[PDB]
Amino acid sequence: CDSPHQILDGENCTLIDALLGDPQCDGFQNKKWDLFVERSKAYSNCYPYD
Amino acid sequence: TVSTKRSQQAVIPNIGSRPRIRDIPSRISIYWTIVKPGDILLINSTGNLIA
Numbered sequence: 001c002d003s004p005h006q007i008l009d010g011e012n013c014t015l016i017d018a019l020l021g022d023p024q025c026d027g028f029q030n031k032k033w034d035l036f037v038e039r040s041k042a043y044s045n046c047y048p049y050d
Numbered sequence: 051t052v053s054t055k056r057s058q059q060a061v062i063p064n065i066g067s068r069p070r071i072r073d074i075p076s077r078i079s080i081y082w083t084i085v086k087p088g089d090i091l092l093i094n095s096t097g098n099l100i101a
């Protein structure tokens with residue numbers, strides 16, 4: 001349930017890929033949130049990194 | 051260089067004297083790497099590797 005806490009769905013992005021800005025994760029740019037929800041479907045599409 | 055598709059480990063050998071144990075003043079540092087299924091371990095070395 002979304003209403004009480006600001007939910008931000010990660011979809012195909014991890015929190016890190018959004019922070020670094022994997023081009024597919026450009027929608028999450030500058031977005032604040034109360035709860036991020038990393039998905040299991042989420043992949044990383046850009047440069048290999050650890 | 052011991053590397054996996056998920057992570058990478060790299061170590062440089064540090065030369066120098068160590069107090070001799072069993073008449074052997076050299077030493078060995080041991081590391082470990084776990085490879086999940088569907089991933090591939092690869093080793094790159096130019097020296098001092100005890101694979």
Ligand SMILES: *[C@@H]1O[C@H](CO)[C@@H](O[C@@H]2O[C@H](CO)[C@@H](O[C@@H]3O[C@H](CO)[C@@H](O)[C@H](O)[C@@H]3O)[C@H](O)[C@H]2NC(C)=O)[C@H](O)[C@H]1NC(C)=O
Nearest residue numbers: 009010011012013023024025026027039041042043044045
């Ligand atoms: C999040 O990631 C998933 C999986 O990478 C995305 O689902 C995939 O979306 C693409 C298009 O965005 C689909 O490609 C197209 O599929 C249709 C229907 O099969 C086909 O007619 C086209 O030729 C093309 O292949 C892809 O099929 C779909 N994957 C699955 C398993 O359905 C999703 O779109 C991503 N969402 C976001 C916001 O990034």
Ligand SMILES: *[C@@H]1O[C@H](CO)[C@@H](O[C@@H]2O[C@H](CO)[C@@H](O[C@@H]3O[C@H](CO)[C@@H](O)[C@H](O)[C@@H]3O)[C@H](O)[C@H]2NC(C)=O)[C@H](O)[C@H]1NC(C)=O
Nearest residue numbers: 063064065066067068069070071072073074075076077078
């Ligand atoms: C730097 O300092 C270390 C510490 O002293 C040196 O290691 C020591 O080297 C001497 C060489 O004479 C070793 O003595 C040996 O003792 C055995 C004991 O059985 C004997 O059989 C040999 O004939 C010899 O006398 C000593 O064991 C060794 N280790 C220690 C803890 O003293 C080292 O040689 C110095 N130099 C360099 C370049 O590292």
